[PDB]
Structures are given as structure tokens and as C-alpha cells.
Write a protein that binds this ligand. Sequence first.
Ligand SMILES: [Zn+2]
Ligand SMILES: [Zn+2]
Lengths: 176, 176, 275, 248
Amino acid sequence: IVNEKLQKIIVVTDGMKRLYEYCNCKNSLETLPSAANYGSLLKRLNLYNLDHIEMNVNFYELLFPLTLYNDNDKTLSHQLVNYIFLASNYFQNCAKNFNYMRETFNVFGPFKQIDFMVMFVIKFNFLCDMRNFAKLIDELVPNKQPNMRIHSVLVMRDKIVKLAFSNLQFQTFSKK
Amino acid sequence: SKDIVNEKLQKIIVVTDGMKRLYEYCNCKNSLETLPSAANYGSLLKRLNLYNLDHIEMNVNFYELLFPLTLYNDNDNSDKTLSHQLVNYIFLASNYFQNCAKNFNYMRETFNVFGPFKQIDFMVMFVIKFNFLCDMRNFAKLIDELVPNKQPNMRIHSVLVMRDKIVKLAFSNLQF
Amino acid sequence: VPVGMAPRQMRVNRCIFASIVSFDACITYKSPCSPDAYHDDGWFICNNHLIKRFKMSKMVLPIFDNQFKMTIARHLVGNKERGIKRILIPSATNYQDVFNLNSMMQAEQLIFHLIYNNENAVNTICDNLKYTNTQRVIHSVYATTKSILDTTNPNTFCSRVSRDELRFFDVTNARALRGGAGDQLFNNYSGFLQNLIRRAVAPEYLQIDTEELRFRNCATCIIDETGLVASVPDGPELYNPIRSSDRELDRTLSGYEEYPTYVPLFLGYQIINSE
Amino acid sequence: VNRCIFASIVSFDACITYKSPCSPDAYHDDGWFICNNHLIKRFKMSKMVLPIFDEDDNQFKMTIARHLVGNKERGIKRILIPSATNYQDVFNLNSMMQAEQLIFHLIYNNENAVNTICDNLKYNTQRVIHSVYATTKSILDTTNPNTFELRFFDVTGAGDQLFNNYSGFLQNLIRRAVAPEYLQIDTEELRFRNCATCIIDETGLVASVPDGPELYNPITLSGYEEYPTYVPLFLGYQIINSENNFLR
Ligand SMILES: [Zn+2]
Ligand SMILES: [Zn+2]
């Protein structure tokens, strides 16, 4: 299985949006998630305990399926790399200011699971942007037999994102 | 917060108890002594093949997976060898993950011999994680339910950070 | 009286426009070339030609204990400059417009055509220069320009240019939409053009394995269809005090390692790793 | 004759140390009230200036400081100028002399600690501390605007409010180091930076940037000049009033 991941990502994102009755993909983001946009999302999330929330995104594998698209034609060859760097910077800022993000979201109706809420909104906004990009590139055909040489950039940015999440996790844990 | 982390610990115990019989594996005799072998999972691999296994993460959140254990009544001031045992456990877990990542291909041929199916790329990781979680359950059995609401330990957190950085880098290096 | 020993080896001028010579054997000409052209550096254009044509001046950015000094150029576009004036380096689709080829030496016109391909104009010029000595000048100019172009030619081998680096100077502005295409046009850009862009424009960030060094938190120039544009991405242009080429407070303020007033070129991430 | 804050530290005691660690630029009667050594060792900054242009023949050496903070510093290590709420925390009050502790207490409005230290030191020490008071308060009053140019640090007003919260000497230091990304020259607005190099917040001045990672700032092209790699301080929007080329 080297291609089913993309369609399963689409399906699981749709199912999660259904489960939490929220599909606000309209508010595409490039600076920082905010309660100004995701306050109702916080309220919806409070309905169900957010135990299944991870302190990382698995950047590389997460974005790997997007490479499958055929770009023989280039459009994807550069738009995808743009997206990779954008995601890298977005996660950098999110992890760097997670405390600021969580104080803000908590100020919006403090939640016992505030950290879960902030992480989930980060994940959800990223998934919305990713699905918008996937629609932008829905014309291209995903398939295996890859040879990119930009997945090396993907690996590098994934390492950077993992280190950022690592510092974030260390802060959260060490602060009791 | 760390109360949610205690909830995470109890949840992982109960959820291991749950899936070890929902899928009736409990390969609970194995440990992190060295690289696992398909010879101890043949039938378990057959049962795994009954399900699509792409719903798995290439990287391991070694941080969040092991942090809950750090919460224990170290204030008893009776068994500091318990904390040292935890340090040994975390370090050996990091080594186990690092070796699994380094020789992931080797395990790929192993499980090619054992159940040559496309899902082997996920079966290897599932075996790794499931054996690890059985070891976690055994470690939980060894330790006592002395989990406090909150507990700071700089040394343990630092060890976690430095070992998991290697772990995450190794997992990220799994290109394809 | 006369003295001579044997043929001698001397320096080499590395700027393309050094090959500019009047097509006249009876009327001598000497191109104005900065002595920097005689440095075995990536720069295949001398500071004089660079400033004269692309409105750019050479500069060095000494990044460091592990000091690896790297090349960089800087703006010479005035603050009030607009439109075509802002195109720091024209593209093949507009270089004819930006450069008044009609008012310059025909050798220079041929050189610029070679830089921007335009093989049709190149052939027209060669035919005109052949059907009229002038063939010798054809040979000299075209051979030198083509030699330099093939040397740059990043999309080949045997050229000593590609370092397997993956600099993305089309990196998103972080507020534009799904776009960029600067590197698409770069792919289309001539080899000398691409190498000039690489040398002149330093990356915003330097990525080394798992290390990212930040040098400019906002790009100073952009790449678009017209080519390299000396425009601030976010609107209001930076002030550029053009000084040359083309009081008591200060006396009180003795030397304090005064910061330069220039605007170097920052754009993109430069990706290099051990793999 | 020179000028240097913390150079007024006279050997009031016979306790720890004193050698007058003052950079020679203290003799330079610039707009600063602190010299290079003290600036570097108490705010992680280096004095610098900047000319502008000869279009109107101004070329004024605009005052500015250099970041001495790398991209790995966090929190306190990244704070350049602390607020009155955090200066005590960032500064090792137990390391510096009680004279410099008094200077910090005065400049940050901690007269309670000032009097506490005075009373403790009383047991020639009192008169020497009074001399320190005289020098420090003279400097503070000189910097204080309250006596006989819309340099917004927020517009490019919470930031301006924080700057105002700073003392006269501290406000002077902030305005001398920081350089607005925008400067109006009496009805002609000029942009000099497309981005900021520092941020003013509740904790005080921080060598940070609006977004992304921290600017990298560490401690054979021989035939070409060099461009400095360090990061100067940049923040705000200043407007010059109805005044001529006031080279005075
Ligand atoms: Zn020349
Ligand atoms: Zn001094």
C-alpha cells in the first residue's frame, strides 16, 4: 500500500469533520490558529474527550501522499515544495507559541482539555489547508513509481518539525 | 494537565488490556531485549493480515508514550533504584526503537519470509509497537499505582528529551 | 635591442562583457571592465557590467567559528523607481524591452541575445556580420559567450556548477496563495542567468542537515515573469540612497562600526546536507 | 571627563571587587548615557550608528545598537532590556555590587530596596553611597524629559505605553538602540527595513522577531567588500515634525 494513504486521509478527515460537526475549511491560515476562528470548534470538541491527541504530526509521512500526484506536464514540482516550507514554518510558529495559543483558546471559555484543544485545532487547520491544496491538485493523478528528490527536502523539514514538537513537549512536561 | 497524563496512563493500560483480546495477541512474554523476530509472531502476523494496516504512524511519539510513567510517588524516598530502573527502561526503549528503525529493512525481509504481503511495511511497525506495549504493560505490573497529580523531575525529563531526539531522527530517516 | 623569450601565460577576464569589442578593425575600442573580472570566483560578470546593466553590485556575506564566506549582491534601485525600473534582472520575455539594444554595440546585443537564447536574433546578427574580419569578430565574440554559457549551464555535467544543493528561492511569501513559479521560470532561465541569480541573491535561511540559520526575516527581492524584481514583497519600498556610479552630529558620532545603508538581496532557503 | 552609568560605583565597601570596567567610549559625549562595556555586559548590545543619504546632504549617523543574542537564546536569555517586573530576575543582584544594585533599583523605581541596601551598608560607606546616589540621580534626571518625535514603537498604543513605563534613562536607552523601520522626514515617509528585529513586551525588550525562527546571530572572495552579519535593532514608526535639515 503506497497510494491508499491519500484517499484514506481524505476519508478520515471527512469522518472526523462529521464526528465533531465542524468542517470550517474556509478559514485558510498561514500565521497562527486563533479562537477568533475556532471558538465554536472548541465548544464542539468539549463534547467529546480528546484523549487521542498526539504531540507531533509525523510531517514527512503526513505529507508524503501528496507526492503521488502525476506532474508530468511544472506546477506541482514547485507548489508542493512551497507547501512543504509553509507547513514547516506554520508548525514552527505553532510549537514556538503553543503556550500563547493555549492561553488564548482557554481565555475563550477555559477547557479542562485546553492542550488537547489547541493541538486539535492546529491539526484541523492544517488538515483544512491540506485538503484545499489537494482539491487544487485533484486534477493530477496520484500513483506510485515515485522519483522526486524533493522528498529529501520533505525529510529535512520533517526533522525540523519533529525537533520543534520535541522542544514543545519538553516544555509542557518539565513545567509540571 | 498532568492529571490528563495520569488519565493517559490508565487509558493505555486499559486499552492494551482491550486490544490484546479484541485481537487476542498478548505476545506478553517478549520484551525490548533486542530486535524482535517474526518467529514469535507468525500466527499474530496471520491475524494482522486480516486488517488493513496503513492506519499507522511511521514515527513513534516516544515522549508522550513514556512520559506518563514518569509520574510516580518518588517522594517515598525509599526506592531511588525505582527511578534508576525507570531511567534504564527509557534508555533501553530508545535503543530498541533506534535498532528497529536502523534494521527496519531487515525486519522487512523477515516478515517477507513470514506472510509475504504488501502490508508488511506496516506489519513490521505493528509488531514493534505491540511488543513494546506488552513490555509497557509488564513494566506497569512491576511498578505500583503511585501516580501523583503532578511531579517534576528534571533529570528524567532531560534523558527523555535527548534519547527521543535520536529516536525521532532515526524514524524520520525511514525514507521511501 | 629587442628582447623576447617565449609565449607567456597571464590572467583571464571572466566577465562575459569583456568580450565586447567594436566590430571595427579600423576603430579601436576597449570595454570598461572592473579588475574583479580576474578573480576565479563564480561571478562571470565584472562589477562594472553588473552595475551598468543589472543595477547590482557585488558583496560578500561572511557567515560564521565555522566561517564559510559566501557571495551576495545588493540593490541599486532607487526608492522612487517603479515598474520596469524595478526589474532588477529581466527575463527572456522582456530583456529586449528593458535593454535598449538599438542604442548599444551590436556585439553587446548579440551577447544579450545569447544570454536570453533568442537564437533567431543570434543567427540574424551572424548572417549580417558574415555578409559584409567581421567573421573573425563573430568567431571571437560568439565563442567566448558560448563558452561561458556552457560553463555555467547548470543543467548539465562536466561544468562544475551543480553542487546537488536544493535552494528554493521560490519559497512562498507565507501570505501569497498557492503560487511561486519563480523556480519554474528559473528552470527556464539561461545557465548564466541562473548562476548569476544564485550568486547575487543570498538565501533568507540556510538549511544544513538539521540546522536552519536565519539571516533575513523578510525577503528583499522577488522573482516573477519579468525576472528579478527589486521590490519589497509587502509593499512600501525600502529607501535606497544611490550615491555614485550610474554634520556636527556626525562629527560628534565617531566611528561605531556604522551599519551599511545598502539593501542586500535576500530570498529563499538554501538546502545542503550530508546525504 | 566621561559618562558611564554604573561607572559611578565607588568602593563604598571592602567586600567583593571594583576595577572601573568602563569602555573608553564613555568619554564620547554621545546621546548615550552608557558606554560599550556596560551596554554589552548588561543588555547584550553593542553601540553603532548609521548614515542615511546625500540626496539632501544629510548622511546623519543614525544611532543604533547591535544584537548580541543568538538564535538559541530563550526567555530571559533573549530579553535585552527587562521591565521593572523582571529586571531583578534577569540580573544577578547577588553578583554585581550593591552600588549597581542600587542603580538598578533607582532606575526601575525600587526605592524600597534602595533604602534597604543603604541601611544595611551603613554598618564612609554611607557618604560613598550618597555620592553614588548623586551621580545616578543626576544621570536619571538628565535623561528624564520632565525638566526645563512620535517615535512610535507599535505603529510601523501598547508598545509605546510600555516604553513610556520605562524610566527616562531607560527610555533614552531604548530610543537610542532601537531604530524605527519607518522614519518620516517632515512629510516624506521613508522605509528602511521590511521587517522588525526586536519586540517590546511586558517583560521589556526582547531580541525576537514577529514570526519564524530567531535571527541567527553568532559571536576566497578577498577582492570584494563585506556586509555585516549581525542583526541591528529595529522597531517602530517615527515622524519628524515641521523642522528643516536639523543637523544640530
Ligand atoms: Zn568586465
Ligand atoms: Zn563604562
